[PDB]
Design a protein around this ligand. Structure first.
Ligand SMILES: Nc1ncnc2[nH]cnc12
Ligand SMILES: [Zn+2]
Ligand SMILES: [Zn+2]
Length: 368
Protein backbone atom coordinates (compact mmCIF):
# COMPACT_ATOMS: atom_id res chain seq x y z
CA UNK A 1 0.00 0.00 0.00
CA UNK A 2 1.12 3.49 -1.01
CA UNK A 3 -0.73 6.75 -1.56
CA UNK A 4 0.79 7.54 -4.94
CA UNK A 5 2.71 5.54 -7.51
CA UNK A 6 4.42 6.89 -10.63
CA UNK A 7 5.29 4.42 -13.38
CA UNK A 8 7.15 4.36 -16.70
CA UNK A 9 9.42 7.23 -15.78
CA UNK A 10 13.03 7.78 -16.79
CA UNK A 11 15.77 9.93 -15.30
CA UNK A 12 17.83 12.39 -17.33
CA UNK A 13 20.62 9.78 -17.27
CA UNK A 14 18.42 7.30 -19.15
CA UNK A 15 17.55 5.19 -16.12
CA UNK A 16 14.09 3.57 -15.82
CA UNK A 17 12.39 4.77 -12.65
CA UNK A 18 9.17 4.37 -10.66
CA UNK A 19 8.43 6.21 -7.42
CA UNK A 20 6.18 5.14 -4.54
CA UNK A 21 4.76 7.84 -2.26
CA UNK A 22 3.05 7.72 1.14
CA UNK A 23 2.48 10.44 3.75
CA UNK A 24 3.97 13.28 1.69
CA UNK A 25 7.23 11.30 1.61
CA UNK A 26 9.08 9.10 -0.88
CA UNK A 27 8.49 5.50 0.21
CA UNK A 28 10.31 3.63 -2.57
CA UNK A 29 12.27 4.13 -5.79
CA UNK A 30 13.19 1.46 -8.33
CA UNK A 31 13.16 0.66 -12.04
CA UNK A 32 9.95 -1.24 -11.30
CA UNK A 33 7.63 -1.08 -8.30
CA UNK A 34 4.83 -3.62 -8.02
CA UNK A 35 2.45 -2.43 -5.34
CA UNK A 36 -0.97 -1.02 -4.49
CA UNK A 37 -1.76 2.68 -4.18
CA UNK A 38 -4.71 5.08 -3.96
CA UNK A 39 -3.74 6.53 -7.32
CA UNK A 40 -1.23 5.44 -9.94
CA UNK A 41 0.21 7.59 -12.71
CA UNK A 42 1.29 5.99 -15.98
CA UNK A 43 3.69 8.33 -17.77
CA UNK A 44 4.10 8.28 -21.54
CA UNK A 45 7.25 6.54 -22.81
CA UNK A 46 10.12 9.00 -23.06
CA UNK A 47 8.97 11.14 -20.14
CA UNK A 48 11.64 12.25 -17.69
CA UNK A 49 11.39 12.51 -13.90
CA UNK A 50 13.67 14.16 -11.37
CA UNK A 51 13.61 15.55 -7.85
CA UNK A 52 11.35 18.59 -7.66
CA UNK A 53 13.21 21.51 -9.24
CA UNK A 54 14.41 24.19 -6.82
CA UNK A 55 15.01 27.87 -7.65
CA UNK A 56 17.22 29.25 -4.86
CA UNK A 57 17.09 32.89 -5.97
CA UNK A 58 13.60 34.30 -6.25
CA UNK A 59 11.48 37.31 -5.27
CA UNK A 60 7.94 36.28 -4.41
CA UNK A 61 6.66 38.45 -1.54
CA UNK A 62 3.52 39.60 -3.39
CA UNK A 63 3.03 42.68 -1.18
CA UNK A 64 6.42 44.26 -1.94
CA UNK A 65 6.56 47.44 -4.05
CA UNK A 66 8.10 46.72 -7.45
CA UNK A 67 10.34 43.74 -6.74
CA UNK A 68 7.69 41.00 -6.33
CA UNK A 69 5.74 38.12 -7.86
CA UNK A 70 3.23 35.40 -6.99
CA UNK A 71 4.74 32.16 -5.60
CA UNK A 72 2.72 29.74 -7.68
CA UNK A 73 3.35 31.62 -10.94
CA UNK A 74 7.11 31.05 -10.58
CA UNK A 75 6.79 27.78 -8.72
CA UNK A 76 4.37 24.91 -9.20
CA UNK A 77 3.12 26.31 -12.51
CA UNK A 78 6.67 26.18 -13.90
CA UNK A 79 7.59 22.76 -12.56
CA UNK A 80 9.42 24.28 -9.60
CA UNK A 81 8.43 22.60 -6.33
CA UNK A 82 10.48 24.83 -4.01
CA UNK A 83 11.60 28.47 -4.18
CA UNK A 84 13.78 30.58 -1.93
CA UNK A 85 13.08 34.29 -1.79
CA UNK A 86 16.45 36.08 -1.86
CA UNK A 87 16.06 38.60 0.96
CA UNK A 88 13.08 40.56 -0.29
CA UNK A 89 12.17 41.01 3.37
CA UNK A 90 14.06 41.84 6.52
CA UNK A 91 13.23 40.96 10.13
CA UNK A 92 10.59 43.71 10.19
CA UNK A 93 8.44 42.32 7.37
CA UNK A 94 9.35 38.65 6.97
CA UNK A 95 6.38 37.58 9.12
CA UNK A 96 3.87 39.24 6.81
CA UNK A 97 5.63 37.43 3.96
CA UNK A 98 5.68 34.14 5.88
CA UNK A 99 1.91 34.16 6.42
CA UNK A 100 1.21 34.60 2.71
CA UNK A 101 3.89 32.06 1.81
CA UNK A 102 1.91 29.33 3.58
CA UNK A 103 -1.14 29.49 1.31
CA UNK A 104 1.00 28.77 -1.76
CA UNK A 105 1.02 25.30 -3.32
CA UNK A 106 4.74 25.75 -3.91
CA UNK A 107 7.09 25.26 -0.97
CA UNK A 108 8.44 28.70 -0.13
CA UNK A 109 11.53 29.39 1.96
CA UNK A 110 13.39 32.63 2.35
CA UNK A 111 16.64 34.37 3.17
CA UNK A 112 16.34 37.25 5.60
CA UNK A 113 17.93 40.48 4.37
CA UNK A 114 20.47 41.77 6.88
CA UNK A 115 18.66 45.12 6.52
CA UNK A 116 15.49 44.98 8.67
CA UNK A 117 13.14 46.29 5.97
CA UNK A 118 14.52 44.18 3.14
CA UNK A 119 14.60 45.75 -0.31
CA UNK A 120 11.91 48.38 0.37
CA UNK A 121 14.18 51.08 -1.05
CA UNK A 122 16.91 50.43 -3.61
CA UNK A 123 19.76 51.21 -1.21
CA UNK A 124 18.85 49.29 1.93
CA UNK A 125 22.51 49.06 2.95
CA UNK A 126 23.20 52.80 2.59
CA UNK A 127 21.91 53.37 6.14
CA UNK A 128 23.74 51.02 8.52
CA UNK A 129 21.30 51.52 11.39
CA UNK A 130 18.90 49.34 9.39
CA UNK A 131 21.35 46.46 9.73
CA UNK A 132 20.69 45.18 13.26
CA UNK A 133 22.27 41.80 14.03
CA UNK A 134 19.79 41.31 16.87
CA UNK A 135 16.75 41.67 14.64
CA UNK A 136 18.13 39.08 12.22
CA UNK A 137 18.84 36.61 15.03
CA UNK A 138 15.27 36.99 16.28
CA UNK A 139 13.84 36.23 12.85
CA UNK A 140 15.99 33.12 12.54
CA UNK A 141 14.82 31.88 15.95
CA UNK A 142 11.23 32.86 15.19
CA UNK A 143 10.83 31.06 11.85
CA UNK A 144 13.24 28.08 11.67
CA UNK A 145 10.89 26.33 9.23
CA UNK A 146 11.08 29.28 6.84
CA UNK A 147 14.37 31.16 7.15
CA UNK A 148 17.18 29.18 5.53
CA UNK A 149 19.80 31.90 5.32
CA UNK A 150 20.57 35.72 4.96
CA UNK A 151 20.94 37.87 1.76
CA UNK A 152 23.53 40.72 1.37
CA UNK A 153 23.39 42.72 -1.86
CA UNK A 154 26.95 43.99 -2.26
CA UNK A 155 26.83 46.45 -5.17
CA UNK A 156 27.07 50.19 -5.89
CA UNK A 157 23.40 51.20 -5.83
CA UNK A 158 22.81 49.25 -2.62
CA UNK A 159 25.63 50.23 -0.25
CA UNK A 160 25.90 53.99 -0.74
CA UNK A 161 29.16 54.95 0.99
CA UNK A 162 29.32 51.99 3.39
CA UNK A 163 31.76 50.08 1.19
CA UNK A 164 32.54 46.51 2.27
CA UNK A 165 31.35 47.06 5.85
CA UNK A 166 27.90 45.52 5.19
CA UNK A 167 29.48 42.21 4.21
CA UNK A 168 31.61 42.09 7.36
CA UNK A 169 28.40 42.55 9.33
CA UNK A 170 26.86 39.75 7.26
CA UNK A 171 29.71 37.40 8.15
CA UNK A 172 29.39 38.37 11.83
CA UNK A 173 25.64 37.71 11.76
CA UNK A 174 26.43 34.34 10.17
CA UNK A 175 28.84 33.58 13.00
CA UNK A 176 26.13 34.52 15.52
CA UNK A 177 23.60 32.12 13.99
CA UNK A 178 25.27 28.71 13.69
CA UNK A 179 26.96 29.51 10.37
CA UNK A 180 23.60 29.92 8.65
CA UNK A 181 23.97 30.08 4.84
CA UNK A 182 24.82 33.47 3.34
CA UNK A 183 23.98 34.55 -0.22
CA UNK A 184 26.01 37.41 -1.69
CA UNK A 185 24.81 39.51 -4.60
CA UNK A 186 27.45 41.24 -6.71
CA UNK A 187 27.10 43.91 -9.35
CA UNK A 188 28.88 47.16 -10.13
CA UNK A 189 31.67 48.41 -7.88
CA UNK A 190 31.96 49.40 -5.12
CA UNK A 191 32.86 47.18 -3.58
CA UNK A 192 35.44 45.64 -5.89
CA UNK A 193 34.88 41.93 -6.54
CA UNK A 194 38.25 40.88 -5.13
CA UNK A 195 37.43 42.57 -1.83
CA UNK A 196 34.10 40.72 -1.74
CA UNK A 197 35.48 37.32 -2.71
CA UNK A 198 38.26 37.71 -0.16
CA UNK A 199 35.77 37.78 2.72
CA UNK A 200 33.62 34.88 1.50
CA UNK A 201 34.31 31.29 2.52
CA UNK A 202 33.44 27.81 1.29
CA UNK A 203 29.68 27.44 1.57
CA UNK A 204 28.93 31.12 0.99
CA UNK A 205 26.79 31.51 -2.11
CA UNK A 206 27.90 33.99 -4.76
CA UNK A 207 24.84 34.81 -6.87
CA UNK A 208 24.89 36.63 -10.26
CA UNK A 209 28.17 34.75 -10.79
CA UNK A 210 28.21 35.19 -14.58
CA UNK A 211 27.12 38.82 -14.81
CA UNK A 212 28.79 40.83 -17.57
CA UNK A 213 29.57 43.99 -15.63
CA UNK A 214 33.15 45.33 -15.43
CA UNK A 215 33.29 44.34 -11.76
CA UNK A 216 32.28 40.80 -12.72
CA UNK A 217 34.48 37.68 -12.92
CA UNK A 218 35.58 38.21 -16.54
CA UNK A 219 38.55 40.48 -17.24
CA UNK A 220 37.28 42.32 -20.31
CA UNK A 221 40.84 43.42 -21.15
CA UNK A 222 42.32 39.93 -21.51
CA UNK A 223 39.03 38.12 -22.05
CA UNK A 224 40.02 35.74 -19.27
CA UNK A 225 38.49 34.88 -15.92
CA UNK A 226 40.15 36.96 -13.21
CA UNK A 227 42.55 34.94 -11.03
CA UNK A 228 41.00 35.85 -7.69
CA UNK A 229 37.64 34.68 -9.04
CA UNK A 230 39.21 31.28 -9.74
CA UNK A 231 40.69 31.36 -6.25
CA UNK A 232 37.32 31.92 -4.59
CA UNK A 233 35.86 29.24 -6.86
CA UNK A 234 38.70 26.84 -6.07
CA UNK A 235 38.21 27.40 -2.32
CA UNK A 236 34.55 26.40 -2.34
CA UNK A 237 32.58 29.61 -2.82
CA UNK A 238 29.31 28.45 -4.43
CA UNK A 239 28.66 30.13 -7.80
CA UNK A 240 24.92 30.70 -8.29
CA UNK A 241 23.50 32.02 -11.58
CA UNK A 242 20.71 34.33 -10.36
CA UNK A 243 20.03 35.35 -13.99
CA UNK A 244 17.89 38.39 -13.29
CA UNK A 245 17.26 41.37 -15.52
CA UNK A 246 20.94 42.32 -15.63
CA UNK A 247 23.00 39.53 -14.09
CA UNK A 248 23.62 36.85 -16.75
CA UNK A 249 25.95 37.21 -19.72
CA UNK A 250 26.37 34.40 -22.30
CA UNK A 251 29.92 35.39 -23.16
CA UNK A 252 30.96 35.20 -19.51
CA UNK A 253 29.37 31.77 -18.98
CA UNK A 254 30.87 30.47 -22.22
CA UNK A 255 34.31 31.83 -21.38
CA UNK A 256 34.11 30.27 -17.93
CA UNK A 257 33.16 26.88 -19.41
CA UNK A 258 36.08 26.98 -21.85
CA UNK A 259 38.33 27.48 -18.81
CA UNK A 260 36.61 24.57 -17.10
CA UNK A 261 34.44 26.63 -14.76
CA UNK A 262 30.74 25.82 -14.21
CA UNK A 263 28.09 27.31 -11.93
CA UNK A 264 27.24 25.14 -8.92
CA UNK A 265 23.57 26.06 -9.07
CA UNK A 266 21.19 27.57 -11.60
CA UNK A 267 18.66 30.18 -10.46
CA UNK A 268 16.53 32.91 -12.04
CA UNK A 269 16.45 36.00 -9.80
CA UNK A 270 12.95 36.18 -11.24
CA UNK A 271 10.19 38.63 -10.35
CA UNK A 272 7.01 39.59 -12.22
CA UNK A 273 8.68 42.08 -14.58
CA UNK A 274 11.49 39.93 -15.99
CA UNK A 275 9.16 36.91 -15.97
CA UNK A 276 6.40 38.54 -18.02
CA UNK A 277 8.61 40.55 -20.35
CA UNK A 278 11.85 38.57 -20.21
CA UNK A 279 14.85 38.12 -20.37
CA UNK A 280 14.28 35.46 -17.68
CA UNK A 281 10.88 33.90 -18.27
CA UNK A 282 11.21 30.88 -15.98
CA UNK A 283 13.70 28.32 -14.64
CA UNK A 284 13.30 26.02 -17.67
CA UNK A 285 14.39 28.91 -19.93
CA UNK A 286 17.40 29.59 -17.71
CA UNK A 287 18.26 25.89 -17.84
CA UNK A 288 18.07 25.95 -21.65
CA UNK A 289 20.54 28.85 -21.61
CA UNK A 290 23.20 26.83 -19.80
CA UNK A 291 22.39 23.97 -22.14
CA UNK A 292 23.19 26.16 -25.14
CA UNK A 293 26.29 27.41 -23.30
CA UNK A 294 27.54 23.83 -23.17
CA UNK A 295 26.36 22.10 -19.97
CA UNK A 296 24.69 18.69 -20.45
CA UNK A 297 21.17 17.95 -19.18
CA UNK A 298 22.23 15.60 -16.36
CA UNK A 299 24.39 18.22 -14.64
CA UNK A 300 21.79 20.89 -15.42
CA UNK A 301 19.15 18.86 -13.53
CA UNK A 302 21.54 18.36 -10.63
CA UNK A 303 22.09 22.12 -10.54
CA UNK A 304 18.38 22.87 -9.99
CA UNK A 305 17.83 20.08 -7.44
CA UNK A 306 20.64 18.50 -5.42
CA UNK A 307 22.92 21.56 -5.50
CA UNK A 308 20.41 24.19 -4.32
CA UNK A 309 19.12 21.66 -1.78
CA UNK A 310 22.68 21.39 -0.44
CA UNK A 311 23.46 25.12 -0.65
CA UNK A 312 20.69 25.84 1.85
CA UNK A 313 20.49 22.61 3.81
CA UNK A 314 17.09 21.49 2.54
CA UNK A 315 17.88 18.04 3.95
CA UNK A 316 14.45 16.71 3.02
CA UNK A 317 14.58 17.77 -0.65
CA UNK A 318 16.75 17.70 -3.77
CA UNK A 319 16.99 13.95 -4.36
CA UNK A 320 14.80 10.91 -4.97
CA UNK A 321 15.84 9.20 -1.73
CA UNK A 322 13.55 7.14 0.49
CA UNK A 323 12.46 9.16 3.49
CA UNK A 324 12.69 12.43 1.56
CA UNK A 325 9.80 14.77 0.79
CA UNK A 326 7.65 13.71 -2.15
CA UNK A 327 8.46 16.61 -4.49
CA UNK A 328 9.00 15.71 -8.14
CA UNK A 329 9.09 17.35 -11.53
CA UNK A 330 7.95 15.38 -14.57
CA UNK A 331 9.02 16.77 -17.92
CA UNK A 332 10.03 16.31 -21.54
CA UNK A 333 13.08 17.43 -23.51
CA UNK A 334 12.59 18.10 -27.21
CA UNK A 335 14.60 19.19 -30.22
CA UNK A 336 13.19 22.54 -31.32
CA UNK A 337 14.92 25.84 -32.01
CA UNK A 338 14.24 28.77 -29.70
CA UNK A 339 15.79 32.23 -29.35
CA UNK A 340 17.36 33.00 -25.99
CA UNK A 341 18.40 36.45 -24.80
CA UNK A 342 20.58 37.18 -21.79
CA UNK A 343 20.64 40.20 -19.47
CA UNK A 344 22.84 42.19 -21.83
CA UNK A 345 21.10 41.57 -25.14
CA UNK A 346 23.34 38.73 -26.35
CA UNK A 347 21.35 36.14 -28.32
CA UNK A 348 21.77 32.39 -28.83
CA UNK A 349 19.64 29.84 -30.66
CA UNK A 350 18.80 26.85 -28.47
CA UNK A 351 18.29 23.47 -30.12
CA UNK A 352 16.67 21.79 -27.12
CA UNK A 353 13.75 22.77 -24.87
CA UNK A 354 12.85 21.36 -21.46
CA UNK A 355 9.18 21.44 -20.41
CA UNK A 356 7.46 20.34 -17.19
CA UNK A 357 4.17 18.53 -17.79
CA UNK A 358 3.42 17.42 -14.23
CA UNK A 359 4.57 18.70 -10.87
CA UNK A 360 4.20 16.85 -7.59
CA UNK A 361 4.47 18.65 -4.27
CA UNK A 362 4.33 16.92 -0.91
CA UNK A 363 2.65 14.04 -2.67
CA UNK A 364 0.02 16.22 -4.35
CA UNK A 365 -0.21 16.22 -8.15
CA UNK A 366 -0.44 19.39 -10.25
CA UNK A 367 -0.75 19.30 -14.04
CA UNK A 368 1.53 21.56 -16.10
N1 LIG B 1 19.66 42.52 -8.08
C1 LIG B 1 19.16 43.78 -8.35
N2 LIG B 1 17.84 44.04 -8.25
C2 LIG B 1 17.33 45.26 -8.50
N3 LIG B 1 18.11 46.28 -8.86
C3 LIG B 1 19.45 46.12 -8.98
N4 LIG B 1 20.50 46.94 -9.33
C4 LIG B 1 21.64 46.19 -9.27
N5 LIG B 1 21.37 44.97 -8.92
C5 LIG B 1 20.04 44.84 -8.73
ZN1 LIG C 1 20.62 40.72 -6.81
ZN1 LIG D 1 17.42 39.10 -6.56
Amino acid sequence: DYDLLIKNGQTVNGMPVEIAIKEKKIAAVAATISGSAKETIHLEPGTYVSAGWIDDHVHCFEKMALYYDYPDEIGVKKGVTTVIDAGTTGAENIHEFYDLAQQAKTNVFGLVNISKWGIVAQDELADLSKVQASLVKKAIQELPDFVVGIKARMSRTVIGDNGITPLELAKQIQQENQEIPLMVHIGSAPPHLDEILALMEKGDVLTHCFNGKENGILDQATDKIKDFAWQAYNKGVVFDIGHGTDSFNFHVAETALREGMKAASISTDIYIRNRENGPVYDLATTMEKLRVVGYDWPEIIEKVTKAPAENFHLTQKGTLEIGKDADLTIFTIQAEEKTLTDSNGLTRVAKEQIRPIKTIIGGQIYDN
